[PDB]
Design goal:
The PDB classes it as oxidoreductase. Keywords: PanDDA, SGC - Diamond I04-1 fragment screening, Jmj domain, epigenetics, oxidoreductase. The assembly is monomeric. PanDDA analysis group deposition -- Crystal Structure of JMJD2D in complex with N09449a. The protein is Lysine-specific demethylase 4D. With about 325 residues, the protein is α+β, with helices and mostly antiparallel strands. The protein has one domain: Jelly Rolls (Sandwich). The chain is built from 10 helices and 16 strands. The strands form 3 sheets. It has a 10-stranded mixed sheet. Strands 9-15-11-13 form a 4-stranded antiparallel sheet, with helices on one face. The chain is globular and about 55 Å long. The chain starts with 8 loop residues before the first strand and ends with a helix. It binds N-oxalylglycine (OGA), nickel (II) ion and zinc ion (ZN).
């Protein structure tokens, strides 16, 4: 078996290899990349997402989210407080202000130490889940707004035609902005391109060990666990690498820099944080190997998850027994 230790693999496709997206994902998996839950892909030197980022300041962040923490440094939840709208130019200025800017630090490891020591004592503001794309329409390779759709994948594999669409989201981050432990909706893949700015550090649990993370989460957030059988779907729980190590949870970490893609694989739990002002674009996608994960994906029916209507059809077709109970939570 390839990659038996479930290490995060890093790929350097040539421009020729970068033409066929599906084929390259299949290649990565042939090398065992999916066993980690996360892979990095460094694009060919000849490739670019767009010509410049000089004209993005007028994008609106309609609902910036202030991420307020509760708990202890290594085990905490965060809730999202809605703030007034601001442009990306205004957001960048805020990110760079004395209150919110990245502190002095020696290297990525030093900054990581500071993040886990001090995160809970601040409330950074995140612009998340903004529908849109920063890929140039003329970028033909790995354009996250031009991928084959999950609906078409389901149709090709299973012969079922369903409603729904599948478009990218933009994320504007600043120092300490945080993404909680989660897998994707319906345990889909995700692909994430860091367009510009400061890095993003990722933590990931191998898919074959996801239930170990779930068991620890139930122990660490016992009230949340009693409230919902899939509360990590709420995307509010953080557990530090120190606490994961103390509890023997297998995981890896890696830092993504501007110009790099990350792919998360079905049922690969991940979490992380931004180093400073940045902008990422991400979208979910599927392959034939995903279908069995979609069938088995755990759902939040307590009603806190609140997802896109695109998910209605996935649950309806792949999880018809759960559909009635799941839709009540949505409605
Ligand atoms: O970048 C973020 O804040 C979160 N991204 C993801 O969880 C992803 O791409 O799957
Ligand atoms: Ni994700
Ligand atoms: Zn729930």
């Amino acid at each position: 078996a390839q990659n038996p230790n479930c290490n995060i693999m890093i790929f350097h496709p040539t421009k020729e290899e970068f033409n066929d997206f599906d084929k390259y994902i299949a290649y990565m998996e042939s090398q065992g990349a999916h066993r980690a839950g996360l892979a990095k892909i460094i694009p060919p030197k000849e490739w670019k997402a767009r010509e410049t980022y000089d004209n993005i300041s007028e994008i609106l962040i309609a609902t910036p989210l202030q991420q307020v923490a509760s708990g202890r440094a290594g085990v905490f939840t965060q809730y999202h407080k809605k703030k007034k709208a601001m442009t990306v130019g205004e957001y960048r200025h805020l990110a760079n202000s004395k209150k919110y800017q990245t502190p002095p630090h020696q290297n990525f490891e030093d900054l990581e130490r500071k993040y886990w020591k001090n995160r809970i004592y601040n409330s950074p503001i995140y612009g998340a889940d903004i529908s849109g794309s920063l890929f140039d329409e003329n970028t033909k390779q790995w354009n996250l707004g031009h991928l084959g759709t999950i609906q078409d994948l389901l149709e090709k594999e299973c012969g079922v035609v369903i409603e729904g669409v599948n478009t990218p989201y933009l994320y504007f981050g600043m120092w300490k902005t945080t993404f909680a432990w989660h897998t994707e909706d319906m345990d889909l893949y995700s692909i994430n391109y860091l367009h510009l700015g400061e890095p993003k550090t990722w933590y990931v649990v191998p898919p074959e060990h996801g239930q170990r993370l779930e068991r620890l989460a139930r122990e660490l957030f016992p009230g949340s666990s009693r409230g919902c059988g899939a509360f990590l779907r709420h995307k509010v729980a953080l557990i530090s690498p120190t606490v994961l190590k103390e509890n023997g949870i297998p995981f890896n970490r890696i830092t993504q820099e501007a110009g790099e893609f990350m792919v998360t694989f079905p049922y690969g739990y991940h979490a992380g944080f931004n180093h400073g002002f940045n902008c990422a674009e991400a979208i979910n996608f599927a392959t034939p190997r995903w279908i069995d994960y979609g069938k088995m994906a755990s759902q939040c029916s307590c009603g806190e998850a609140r997802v896109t209507f695109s998910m209605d059809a996935f649950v309806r077709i792949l999880q018809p027994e759960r559909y009635d109970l799941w839709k009540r939570g949505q409605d």
